[PDB]
Amino acid sequence: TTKDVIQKGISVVGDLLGVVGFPFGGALVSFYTNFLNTIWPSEDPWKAFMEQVEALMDQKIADYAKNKALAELQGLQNNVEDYVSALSSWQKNPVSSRNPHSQGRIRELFSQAESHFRNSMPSFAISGYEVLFLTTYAQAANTHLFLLKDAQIYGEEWGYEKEDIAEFYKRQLKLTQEYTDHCVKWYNVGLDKLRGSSYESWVNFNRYRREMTLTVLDLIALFPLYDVRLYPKEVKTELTRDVLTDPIVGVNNLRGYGTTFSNIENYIRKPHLFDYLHRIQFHTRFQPGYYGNDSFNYWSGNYVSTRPSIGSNDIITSPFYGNKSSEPVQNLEFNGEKVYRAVANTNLAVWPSAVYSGVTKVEFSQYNDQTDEASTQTYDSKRNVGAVSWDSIDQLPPETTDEPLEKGYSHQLNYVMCFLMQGSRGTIPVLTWTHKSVDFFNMIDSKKITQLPLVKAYKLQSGASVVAGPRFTGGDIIQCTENGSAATIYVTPDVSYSQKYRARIHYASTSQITFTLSLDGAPFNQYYFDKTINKGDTLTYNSFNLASFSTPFELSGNNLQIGVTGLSAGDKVYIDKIEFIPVN
């Protein structure tokens, strides 16, 4: 269900993570001609973004409104196309071309496009349909910002005056805040409009939350990296959040025997440090069928093990989920492997009184970065497997379908839960996946700006917990409630010529505070940081400030430990990311 927008939704975030920050000008047109075919070739990509949010909501956009949202996304096609053609010429054309004629021509093109976005946008926010338009609003907003930054890059070359540029800069700032906050507000509103009580309500809920994460929340997460003044190099970053695929079922209609809403959501992975899949212990049962044929074996329960982010290796293993095994147990080991796909068989037995569905087979496609070669590891119920009915590609497509899927995939499996049906009529398993952009090693690039999310810390102290991020950070954040050391993340430098660095940190504090950075316990950076919220406040874009440390430093260590002081009682610090700016 939905691979049309959910593919364009992952190509755009997968394509935008290269030209994010200050793109080496050659990659900024190597991007924009992918983005003109992904999101702006016709109005076929824009009438799908609508009918996707419509499907998750069971409500309609009227017809006196579903049009003027397409009449504008045509308006914006040309503009954006025409600007990119012009900009591409500008890039190629040797500087013995840059006469006053072509200057004010690209100038007018950029001004056209940017002008038009500013006129269009409220069309994607009309009162009453803000949720249904959300993806359209997002993809547009994202083209508008990504457009606006070009004024900073080429402004002088095109002959815009100091003011002209600086007026664009203030607009990019205000719109980055307004666009982001709009998207979180209305995402949550829609999400809430879908909580219910049945397994049925839940799958719609989760399908909304998955698809909105891929085609909205992942997109806004990159909006502050279009500020090329604050990010004047290329940025190395990652999305740390979870997504759960739809559950694996042998029937469309479970007739109210699916696990209740409360029984799934209150029991899925709560905000946690980042980890990677380590082990799955499959548990198979026997399903006596109506005849000496349909009787089969089904995946009924499991354990899960996951290995924590780098710095620790002492593993985690889950409670038992589901029912214990009546055939022998199967173990697959996933150390060092990245499970870029999952395909599954299901099967059912029709009984005069009831139906019994199960998952009989799951084949796990996987890849290996330590030693470049792809493989498969499979699970077999060992009795009447049936046919494949569930393909994770249909929900987590690849970034691009150019390369083979083990290079161009978009997600790797993180976690496998097993939920029991009502009146043990089966087990429904649920798969959790993370983004391919995550780096196991926590590498600090030597040419680029590096963003290290505090959820990649391997260890938390002084009563520092992991908290639901505010939807625009790309994941969660660390919550400090106490003075003293709060988080410890392991860190991989890429050279050993003493490459000096400056640090910034992206936080939100209720009071003024002091951050201490250390390496292997040696403290190497401290400074005072400004208040940014009042107690009780709900965290919007402006809640988080991004502030530099005074002193350059080298990465002669691996164990970054972050500490907070200044908290009175009832204070909160929220830490999102730590940044590394390579220096001279």
Numbering used by the authors: 61 to 644
Give passages from the manuscript:
Here, we report the generation of mechano-responsive PEI-modified Cry3Aa protein crystals and their use for NADH recycling over multiple reaction cycles. We have developed a mechanoresponsive polyethylenimine-modified Cry3Aa (PEI-3A) crystal that enables the versatile and long-term recycling of NADH in an approach that is simple to operate.
SEM and X-ray crystallographic analyses of the in vitro-grown Cry3Aa crystals revealed that the crystal framework was unaffected by PEI-modification. The crystal structure also gave no evidence of an ordered PEI monomer or specific residue for PEI attachment, suggesting that, while the PEI molecules bind to the Asp and Glu residues within the nanochannels of the crystal, they are anchored randomly. Similar to what was observed with the Cry3Aa crystals produced in vivo, confocal microscopy confirmed the labeling of PEI and binding of NADH throughout the in vitro-grown PEI-Cry3Aa crystals. Notably, PEI-cationization of Cry3Aa crystals was highly effective in promoting high levels of NADH binding (540 ± 6 μmol/g) —an amount that we hypothesized should be sufficient for facilitating NADH-dependent enzyme reactions. We speculate that the nanochannels of the Cry3Aa crystals and the nature of the interior of the channel provide an optimal environment for the binding of PEI and, subsequently, NADH.
